[PDB]
């Protein structure tokens, strides 16, 4: 309970506007919204997983009640503090709360934890809750058509509220409150970080966004809390063993990145579900190896899926369009059908087969492409998510995946490891999917994206993937070139010429602690050795794919890190030149 | 006689990070609230202890309850369970919860400990009575309306985390979740050393090293029971006249010393809680075959050291972060050293391949015992076709799914030659494609053991799609030094007189009735006549044939153990090995 | 008294004058509920009993629930209401064996008690699936209780039973019988004329409603749409 409003709720801006236009603006401007006879809802249910922001949205709506009286009166009740030991005061108090809601006309009643007030009536149910449901239903049916009282109710278990209140004329419009996605977690982490004395760069907030698949806003708040506490611990470890208050300056405590990496393992994943593929941009180490090929792929996907001018039609919220952009100004039906049928005619049948050698970074390229298509809907058809056995056969699971891709356009149907998918998934399932793609209009944005290792091009011209349109849409991943391999190993050689007075490590605390108040050497490494080891690294990894380049990199990084503390890196260069033989 | 109530924090072994975190959250918000205001954060007021039975949860709550009642400022401990909350009247359970929280706010520096909290606060269900969902709702409300200064701490131990309601386990209500694991070898050493601390004749350090090496799978309760039954076996053999006497005979307690044989006898008569209904933990190399394999196994422990960075990273095992911050200074935007440190792990695979036999069950158990921090995932058919109707693929994919979320992990396939014939083609394709969907820096060891596998069809073949390229071990047969050191414990059994055996010797001299209140005939040319042909018989033998020969000769030597003339034992051995 | 026994409180702002494109089923529904209440002298002359059961089946958002609610608010007048019970096959306690039979018997007791009644089952194949199916969770005793509790031949009274479903295949073929569900009505995705009629219904209470030509264009551009 604080003075909390919006601009604190990240990743749910669209829902607030949808709720404001559904709830707040029809209650506020009936001169506008009664012109079209659209009735405001009697009951609106916020449901979702725990920690997803559902009490925040009602608290922010009640700070939107922080306005002048007789407008948007807000009542804040729970699934408790209504129910009592007596037999009447619960139902009498509910009738009275609704009568005071009618008394101030435009009014909202919010029931946080509505499963506490309205559980399922059965024969293990109490009488007093069953009568609370029996009066709340009759009060909701008593509320008039000219809707001026709106009852919002929140639950984290929606099929544990009583079924009666979900019937028409009751709590019938729902808002699902999911766990946040990556940009939503980025905004939430920014929101938690905002008012710190020493700031946090936006790249680290993006990395912490990509590390927390499964984290609600409560989880990200407590992750920041434990990061602050780990930083206070490492900055002043003497305030912990004191039993008396020490004079500590709170300005020298800065929450670093190592504190966040310790708070990541100090925080329980809370149904993270880190399974299968994750859309994630190409990692910084292999980014020299697959940057230009991924750029060619991104340009080919822009031409194919028309992403250069839509980016979901320059819309993710319609409200920001209607204030910044001036519109173009019934003879407009023929014009709008013409320019819409020409805008949808850009998309024919999207199909991309990304072929490559064995172990040429396809698991990185596919994840970076699915990070590039964030505004799409990904339906992964890999083997581990089809044989996950949800009490259905895999034909049914393929068919339902295609249905969900077809419902939520623009979407991708992402098949990684295509040459393994061909031999593993049965032939009639591949023919079912081929029929599902033949029964598709040529104006539907369902990209069929397939990544293969060493797939024989005969199988897509006259084999089982021939009835998939992979005619001119084969991208070949090349093995990376000499410039890419050179820039790949330049970071390794930069790690080599790095002095042991610059490599962070943990030696013993040989100095005493400050015991607070109670209230000049060169790395011996010649440039000819650097040039020779660069030439040997380039000459060894000739026509290497990305995986066998990563192997050479891992081995040489092991060698370099073994002689980490040496000041004369000659037995390092001798080990490295000897290894590449 | 009974269990303690003044246990201090030094009687708890193996959980030092959690002791430091509990001390932090009971002391630091009381003294320095400005640090919780400088950063805009609220100190955590809720902990959930969870772990296997007998691992330290009620012990740490007891130690904290004793620490609450010693110092110059007094923290009030409030102990509850489901019995003294649940009432048979309408609205009386929730009233008792509210009286607890109000009384703890009144005595404001306060701990509230709910033990077996899944029984007090189960997952809310409409197929249960309304009192349990009502108690969960009242608890959620009372936790959401606490003091908001770190004054009332709420600690709960559930033994099973899944049973508790997910609304209570979200940050805001129970912020921290302390996982009390089964102790590893340093923790088991420290626990056993705590148990054998007030003993008059002490235990050594090398023996507790051996004793913590052999007790994998034990909780702290199982190790305390190991010292208890070891001590009672010592009392039993030191003074067995106690057990047939209905009145108190005088004994001398200083004449009782717990022997190594008594501990080794107590190890046989004790099943830990983790194995009391299940299969026991993977054991190390058994003591007889350590000559035949250990040096070869040591080569494996080097090859698995330069491919996983074992000893370099795991030097801090559930240790206190606070003592690491006190003991080691930081150097103090430049986290590409994280990227090169992650770059040392490329995709770690190991195929330990050898002849038919050759102790590969022992080697696999030894390696899985050596990697106790890793999460092993067993893809042998004893577990894949175990829970039936589930399907091998839903088991194999699930097994890979727990191998890529709880990293470091080991995907363990023993009998790989049998596995790639008795496992459906799709599982290998689903597993091979699941492995090549991983990033290269991701610590999932693919450990595979095979007897007489075709190395030409692992470059090609079904295992072509795994990177068994230059990380393929070779378990060659034991060598003559190792076979000779192996059989040189069998010659020691030949050199025992029948008066040297600790076997069942009769009592002629009866019980001391307490105060109430020759030469072995073994020629040294026979003692190498045995050994030269014993080594000559075991030519290019594997580990299994060697221990079969050892078993036969040990039967022959053991049946003539009552005799001092061992010539008729020698010629039977020479006749057998021929 | 403690069960799901509440009447769904209907609004009189839903009638057949707000339904588009389904006039045959409305005319067949007048002789089922409204005319036996209004003209009981004529049904007694042939000693006939009207069909007490009908299965609404069709794709989602085509107006099966709307047809039932308008049926309730059609002959609820002349101080003679139609008590509307609406249940669903997606309830958590619907597959609760032991409890679900008690709830169904109590629902049919309370529907017999408020004599002109309508029971509407929103997803009847969730409640009465095919007993010869291949999922393990199937309660045959629930379906036999639903079979014997509804009876258009045994004179319970003026209780109309309505079931709604997407396709009548998934419903038990024991429930598609002259005693239980006499009639089945297919509620289709509306065609161009019925989409014009629905879009004329959805805009007739505006300030400046759409023109006829504008509505015709909207009906054409909404191919594949239901009324919802």
């Amino acid at each position: 309970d604080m003075n909390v409003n919006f601009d604190d709720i990240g990743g749910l801006d669209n829902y607030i506007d949808q709720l404001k236009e559904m709830v707040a603006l029809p209650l506020l401007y009936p001169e506008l919204y009664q012109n079209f006879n659209i009735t405001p809802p009697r009951g609106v249910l916020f449901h979702g997983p725990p920690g997803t922001g559902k009490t925040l949205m009602a608290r922010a709506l009640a700070a939107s009640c922080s306005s002048d009286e007789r407008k948007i009166t807000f009542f804040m009740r729970k699934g408790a503090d209504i129910l009592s030991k007596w037999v009447g005061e619960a139902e009498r108090q509910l009738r009275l709360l609704f009568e005071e809601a009618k008394k101030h006309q435009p009014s909202i009643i919010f029931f946080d934890e509505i499963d506490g007030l309205a559980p399922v009536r059965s024969s293990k149910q109490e009488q007093i809750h069953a009568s609370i449901v029996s009066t709340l239903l009759a009060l909701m049916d008593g509320m008039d058509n000219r809707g001026q009282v709106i009852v919002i109710g929140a639950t984290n278990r929606p099929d544990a509220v009583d079924p009666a209140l979900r019937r028409p004329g009751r709590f019938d419009r729902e808002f699902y409150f999911p766990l946040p996605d990556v940009k939503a977690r980025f905004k939430i982490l920014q929101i938690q970080t905002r008012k710190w004395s020493s700031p946090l760069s936006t790249n680290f907030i993006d990395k912490l966004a990509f590390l927390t698949k499964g984290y609600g806003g409560a989880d990200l708040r407590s992750l920041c809390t434990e990061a602050a506490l780990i930083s206070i611990q490492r900055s002043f470890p003497q305030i912990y063993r004191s039993n008396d208050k020490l004079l500590v300056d709170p300005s020298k405590i800065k929450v670093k990145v190592s504190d966040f990496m310790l708070a990541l393992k100090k925080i329980v994943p809370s149904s993270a579900r880190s399974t299968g593929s994750s859309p994630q941009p190409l990692p910084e180490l292999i980014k020299p190896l697959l940057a230009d090929q991924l750029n060619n792929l991104k340009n080919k996907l822009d031409y194919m899926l028309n992403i250069k001018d839509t980016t979901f039609q320059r819309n993710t919220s319609l409200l920001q369009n209607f204030i910044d952009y001036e519109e173009y100004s019934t003879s407009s039906f023929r014009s709008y059908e013409f320019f819409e049928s020409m805008a949808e005619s850009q998309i024919c049948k999207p199909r991309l087969l990304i072929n490559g050698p064995k172990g040429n970074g396809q698991q990185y390229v596919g994840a970076a492409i699915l990070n590039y298509l964030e505004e799409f809907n990904v339906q992964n058809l890999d083997l581990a998510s089809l044989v996950s056995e949800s009490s259905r056969t895999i034909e049914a699971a393929v068919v339902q995946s295609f249905m969900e891709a077809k419902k939520r356009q623009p979407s991708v149907v992402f098949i990684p490891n295509l040459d393994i998918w061909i031999n593993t998934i049965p032939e009639n399932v591949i023919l079912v999917l081929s029929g599902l793609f033949r029964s598709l209009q040529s104006n539907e944005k369902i990209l069929l994206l397939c990544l293969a290792e060493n797939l024989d091009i005969s199988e897509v011209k006259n084999g089982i993937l021939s009835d998939f349109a992979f005619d001119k849409n084969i991208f070949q991943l090349h093995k990376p070139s000499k410039e890419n391999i050179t820039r790949y190993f330049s970071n390794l050689i930069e790690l080599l010429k790095t002095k042991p007075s610059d490599i962070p490590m943990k030696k013993r605390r040989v100095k005493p602690l400050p015991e607070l108040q109670k209230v000049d050497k060169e790395l011996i490494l010649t440039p000819e050795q650097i040039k020779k080891v660069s030439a040997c690294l380039i000459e060894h990894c000739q026509n290497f794919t990305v995986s066998q380049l990563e192997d050479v990199h891992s081995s040489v990084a092991k060698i370099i890190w073994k002689s980490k503390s040496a000041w004369d890196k000659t037995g390092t260069v001798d080990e490295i030149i000897k290894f590449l033989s | 006689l009974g269990v303690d109530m003044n246990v201090n924090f030094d009687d708890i072994g193996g959980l030092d990070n959690y002791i430091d975190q509990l001390k932090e959250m009971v002391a630091l918000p009381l003294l320095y609230p400005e640090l919780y205001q400088n950063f805009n954060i609220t100190p955590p007021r809720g902990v959930l202890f969870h772990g296997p039975p007998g691992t330290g949860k009620t012990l740490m709550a007891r130690a904290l309850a004793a620490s609450c009642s010693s110092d110059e400022r007094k923290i009030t401990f409030f102990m509850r369970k489901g019995a003294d909350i649940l009432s048979k009247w309408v609205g009386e359970a929730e009233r008792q919860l509210r009286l607890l929280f109000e009384e703890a706010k009144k005595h404001q520096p306060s701990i509230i400990f709910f033990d077996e909290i899944d029984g007090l606060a189960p997952v809310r269900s409409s197929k249960q009575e309304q009192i349990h969902a009502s108690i969960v709702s009242t608890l959620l409300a009372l936790m959401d309306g606490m003091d908001n200064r770190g004054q009332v701490i709420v600690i709960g131990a559930t033994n099973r985390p899944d049973a508790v309601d997910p609304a209570l386990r979200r940050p805001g209500r129970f912020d921290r979740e302390f996982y009390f694991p089964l102790p590893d070898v340093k923790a088991r050493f420290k626990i056993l050393q705590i148990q054998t601390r007030k003993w008059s004749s002490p235990l050594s350090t090398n023996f507790i090293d051996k004793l913590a090496f052999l007790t994998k799978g034990y909780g702290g309760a199982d190790l305390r029971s190991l010292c208890t039954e070891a001590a009672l076996i010592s009392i039993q053999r030191s003074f067995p006249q106690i057990y047939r006497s209905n009145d108190k005979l005088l004994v001398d307690p200083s004449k009782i010393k717990v022997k190594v044989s008594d501990f080794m006898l107590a190890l046989k008569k004790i099943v830990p809680s983790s194995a009391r209904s299940t299969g026991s933990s993977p054991q190390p190399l058994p003591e007889l075959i350590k000559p035949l394999l250990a040096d070869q196994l040591n080569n494996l422990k080097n090859k698995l050291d330069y491919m996983l960075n074992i000893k370099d990273t795991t030097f801090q095992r559930n240790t206190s972060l606070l003592q690491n911050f006190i003991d080691y200074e930081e150097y103090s935007s430049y986290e590409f050293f994280e990227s090169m440190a992650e770059s040392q792990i490329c995709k770690p695979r190991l195929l330990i391949n050898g002849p038919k036999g050759n102790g590969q069950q022992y080697v696999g158990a030894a390696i899985l015992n050596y990697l106790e921090e890793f999460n092993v995932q067993n893809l042998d058919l004893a577990s894949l076709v175990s829970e039936s109707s589930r399907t091998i693929e839903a088991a194999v994919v699930q097994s890979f799914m727990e191998a890529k979320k709880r990293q470091p992990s080991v995907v363990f396939i023993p009998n790989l030659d049998i596995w790639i014939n008795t496992i459906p083609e799709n599982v290998i394709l689903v597993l091979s494609g699941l492995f090549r969907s991983l990033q290269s820096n991701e610590k999932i060891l693919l450990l595979c053991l095979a007897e007489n596998l075709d190395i030409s069809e692992v470059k090609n073949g079904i295992l072509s799609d795994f990177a068994f390229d230059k990380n393929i071990f070779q378990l060659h047969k034991p060598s003559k030094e190792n076979i000779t050191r192996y059989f040189s414990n069998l010659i020691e059994l030949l050199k025992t007189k029948p008066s040297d055996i600790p076997m069942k010797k009769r009592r002629v001299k009866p019980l001391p009735e307490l105060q109430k209140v020759k030469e072995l005939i073994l020629t040294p040319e026979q003692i190498k006549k045995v050994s030269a042909c014993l080594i000559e018989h075991c030519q290019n033998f594997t580990v299994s044939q060697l221990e079969d020969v050892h078993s036969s000769v040990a039967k022959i030597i053991w049946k003539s153990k009552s005799a001092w003339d061992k010539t008729g034992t020698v010629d039977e051995i020479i006749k057998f090995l021929s | 008294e403690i069960a799901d026994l509440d009447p769904l409180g209907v609004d009189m702002n839903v009638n057949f004058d707000d339904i588009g494109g389904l006039d045959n089923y409305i005319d067949q529904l007048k002789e089922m509920v409204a005319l036996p209440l209004l003209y009981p002298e004529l049904y007694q002359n042939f000693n006939i009993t009207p069909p007490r059961g009908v299965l609404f089946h069709g794709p989602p958002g085509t107006g099966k629930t709307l047809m039932a609610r308008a049926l309730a608010a059609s002959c609820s007048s002349d101080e003679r209401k139609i008590t509307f019970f609406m249940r669903k096959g997606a309830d958590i306690l619907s597959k609760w064996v032991g409890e679900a039979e008690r709830q169904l018997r109590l629902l049919f007791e309370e529907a017999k008690k408020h004599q002109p009644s309508i029971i509407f089952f929103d997803e009847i194949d969730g409640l009465a699936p095919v007993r010869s199916s291949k999922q393990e969770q199937i309660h045959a005793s629930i379906v036999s209780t639903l079979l014997a509790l509804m009876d258009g031949m045994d004179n319970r009274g003026q209780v109309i039973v309505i079931g709604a479903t997407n396709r009548p295949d998934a419903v038990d073929p024991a429930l598609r019988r002259p005693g239980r569900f006499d009639r089945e009505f297919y509620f289709p995705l509306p065609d161009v004329k019925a989409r014009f009629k629905i879009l004329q219904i959805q805009t007739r209470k505006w300030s400046s409603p759409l023109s006829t030509n504008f509505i015709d264009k909207l009906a054409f551009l909404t191919k594949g749409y239901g009324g919802a």
């Binding site: 030991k85 007596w86 037999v87 024969s123 293990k124 109490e126 009488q127 | 048979k88 009247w89 309408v90 609205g91 197929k127 009575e129 | 609760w96 064996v97 032991g98 409890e99």
Partner: peptide, 15 residues
Amino acid sequence: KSTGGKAPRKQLASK
């Protein structure tokens, strides 16, 4: 799953 319940809360209600 079908199991039954406690005879309902007495509601003493005198104090």
